[PDB]
Structures are given as C-alpha cells and as structure tokens.
C-alpha cells in the first residue's frame, strides 16, 4: 500500500518517456500526405501510423529493462504489439463528444468514415470505437495509461519471443507497480485493474482483425504502394 523508490522511478521514467514521444501539438501532421475525403484516406493514415510506429519505438527503448533484451526479442515484441500500442495511445486524441480522434483542426479530425476510406471495414472499426469509448470511460490517470502501454508491449506470449522468463519478469514488475498505484490512488483497486487487463484482451482481438484486413490491403499493388516502408516492415509477415 506504498510505492517503493524504484517503483516510483519506473513510473517517473515511463511518463517522461511518453511525454517525449507524444507531441500534443500534432504539428508534424502537416508533413504527412494530405487527407482526402477508392481509399482516398489511405496515404494520410498510412503516414500517420508509420509516424506513430516511430514514436512507439522511441517509447519502447525508454521502458526500463527493454533495451537489455536481445534485438530479436525487442523486434518480436514490437512487431506483435505495435498496432495495439497505437490503438492505446490514440485514446488521448479520442473525444466522446464527437466520437472521433481530434489531433487539431478538422483536417486532422478522423471519424470512422475516414478509416473506411483507408481500406478497413466495420468488423474492425466498430469494435475499435467501442474499445475507445470503454477506455475513455475508465478515466485513467496518465500514470495508469503509460503503465498499460508498457505492460502491453512486454507481453511474453507473443510469437517469436525467445527469452520468455526475462520478459515475463519485467511485465510482472510493471503489473506490480500498476496494482500498487491503483490501490493507493483509488478506493478498492482490484476491479479497475481487472478491466485494464481485459482491455488488453480486447486489443488482442482488435489486432487479429486488423492483421486480416491489412493482409488483404497489402496484397493489392494499388493499395500496397500507398503504404510506407516502415509499415510494411512492422505489419508485414516477413522474418
């Protein structure tokens, strides 16, 4: 029922890592290919996701213990969860009043129809929006928000992971910090921690649905050429 110095240091370093890799001004968005409203939004949203993958990579390397892993394990965890971290971190721009992602002006405001113009269907987008609303209604502290992202990235049960025991120990170290934070900051505690873990289960099925739809898009040359090299590396099937 109290945080040790190193538990607090893990929290401090994770929120600082998030502040350095998430620019609330979204001023870099003007360098993306312009939004346009056959898949007129795919160029802009591909640049958005590709840019966000860079930010996720930057955040990952500031997670205590992550850089101590093998380069292969670092990439295996990043490839398997990048889309989940993006969906998690996107909740900061999601607004329940408009049910949209607002990153500044209306040009960079993304509703669900904009994503239909990137090659995705409601079998993914409607569960994604429902996930965003449920995540928004939990009203997480930013400390709980960044701990959840770190916990999602350090999941040992990802394909291609070799040093499993090392990754699970770091994940448990973060879950213990998160559980203690909730217990101190909130009445009770076990209920909220349970739903945060459930949100990670929701992200697994969202990933599954996105990977299916991405594979269909990436195998059509007219759409695949609108992607970016980093997106093809990260979301692709290569090894």
């Amino acid at each position: 029922h109290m945080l040790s110095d190193e538990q607090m240091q893990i929290i401090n370093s994770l929120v600082e890592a998030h502040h350095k890799t998430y620019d609330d001004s979204y001023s870099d968005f003007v360098r993306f290919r312009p939004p346009v409203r056959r898949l007129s939004m795919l160029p802009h949203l591909a640049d958005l996701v590709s840019y966000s993958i860079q930010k996720v990579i930057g955040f990952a390397k500031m997670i205590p213990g992550f850089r101590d892993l093998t380069a292969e394990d670092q990439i295996a965890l990043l490839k398997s969860s990048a889309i989940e971290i993006i969906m998690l971190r996107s909740n900061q721009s999601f607004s329940l009043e408009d049910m949209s992602w607002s990153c500044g002006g209306p040009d960079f405001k993304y509703c669900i129809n904009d994503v239909t113009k990137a090659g995705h269907t409601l079998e993914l987008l409607e569960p994604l929006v429902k996930f965003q609303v449920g995540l928004k209604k939990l009203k997480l502290h930013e400390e709980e928000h960044v701990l959840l992202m770190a916990i999602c990235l350090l999941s040992p049960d990802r394909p291609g992971v070799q040093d499993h025991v090392r990754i699970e120990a770091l994940q448990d170290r973060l879950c213990d910090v998160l559980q203690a934070y909730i217990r101190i900051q909130h009445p009770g505690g076990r209920l909220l921690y349970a739903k945060m873990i459930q949100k990670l289960a929701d992200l697994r099925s969202l990933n599954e649905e996105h990977s299916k739809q991405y594979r269909s898009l990436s195998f059509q040359p007219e759409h695949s050429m609108q992607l970016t090299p980093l997106v093809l590396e990260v979301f692709g099937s290569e090894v």
Partner: peptide
C-alpha cells in the same frame, strides 16, 4: 523485411 527495423542500434 527488417532492414529498417535493425535504427531497435
């Protein structure tokens, strides 16, 4: 391809 993913130094 993991040519770019080799900026994991």
């Amino acid at each position: 391809r993991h040519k770019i993913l080799x900026x994991x130094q």
